[PDB]
Every structure is written in C-alpha cells, then in structure tokens.
Amino acid sequence: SMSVKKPKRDDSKDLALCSMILTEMETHEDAWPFLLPVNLKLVPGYKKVIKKPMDFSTIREKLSSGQYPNLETFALDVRLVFDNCETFNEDDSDIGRAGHNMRKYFEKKWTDTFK
C-alpha cells in the first residue's frame, strides 16, 4: 500500500530472456502453423470465430517495439496462440497436435527460466 513495498524482484533481464524463449519457439519444427498470421481472406470461419488472432511474428514485433509492459502480458499472447489453435482445430489433426506440443514446450521453458 502507500509507502509499503514488497521487495524488488529483478526484472532487468526479462526482455532478453523472453526474446530467447521466443527464438526457441520460432525454430521448433512444429512451429509452422504459428509463424505468420492466419490469412483471414482464405480460411473460412477464422475471422468470425477467433476474436483475437495471434501468431509468433506478431509477438516478435510487439516485443521488439516496447508493446509488452511486463513478462506476464508476453506469456498471455503466447498462450493465446495455443488457445486459438485448440478452438479451431481437432486434437487429432497435425495442427492440433502441433499446438499441444508447442504449449508443453513453452510452459517448461517458462518454468525453468522464471519459476
């Protein structure tokens, strides 16, 4: 509260570390469904169904231009990529499986790096 602060967690490496994690996700073999925005002119249903599209390229631009205020807002966008994937794709499809594998990969790097 006013004039009563919890001790300062060092956040000065967060930017560099989120960039490393993002590089690792970009270079994973199962990243291919997620590298670029889904083409909303060519994929029926996507525009109407998926209220907040997100992809790795869009996260990379936001990170590079100071659009994440902290590491939690970065993790929210990464999870949104996988949540959207589960919404639109059957678990037993190549893309549905890619999404489960990538979420698992992310969540381990997140815990090992920060928790």
Swiss-Prot record:
Positions of the Bromo domain: 9-113
Subcellular location: Nucleus
Tissue expression summary: Expressed at varying levels in several tissues, whereas a smaller transcript was expressed specifically in testis.
Family: Belongs to the WAL family.
Known partners and oligomeric status: Component of the BRF-1 ISWI chromatin remodeling complex, at least composed of SMARCA1 and BAZ2B, which regulates the spacing of histone octamers on the DNA template to facilitate access to DNA. Within the BRF-1 ISWI chromatin remodeling complex interacts with SMARCA1; the interaction is direct. Component of the BRF-5 ISWI chromatin remodeling complex, at least composed of SMARCA5/SNF2H and BAZ2B, which regulates the spacing of histone octamers on the DNA template to facilitate access to DNA.
Function recorded in the entry: Regulatory subunit of the ATP-dependent BRF-1 and BRF-5 ISWI chromatin remodeling complexes, which form ordered nucleosome arrays on chromatin and facilitate access to DNA during DNA-templated processes such as DNA replication, transcription, and repair. Both complexes regulate the spacing of nucleosomes along the chromatin and have the ability to slide mononucleosomes to the center of a DNA template. The BRF-1 ISWI chromatin remodeling complex has a lower ATP hydrolysis rate than the BRF-5 ISWI chromatin remodeling complex.
The protein's name in its UniProt record: Bromodomain adjacent to zinc finger domain protein 2B
Organism: Homo sapiens (Human)
Lineage summary: Eukaryota, Metazoa, Chordata, Craniata, Vertebrata
Span within the parent record: 2054 to 2166 of 2168
